[PDB]
Amino acid sequence: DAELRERLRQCEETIEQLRAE
Amino acid sequence: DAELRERLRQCEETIEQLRAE
Secondary structure, eight states: HHHHHHHHHHHHHHHHHHHOO | OOHHHHHHHHHHHHHHHHOOO
16 A cells, blocks of 8 residues: 555645645 | 545645646
8 A cells, every 4th residue: 555655645745835835 | 445546536636726726
């Protein structure tokens, strides 16, 4: 389940950054 | 992992919307 979990983690980080911008 | 995959799709849609905006 490493792949899906890391994909979701990266998506959450990118969403955070995009919302800040 | 079906819930994981649909959450991944939700995050993909969210990031797409954020990039467009």
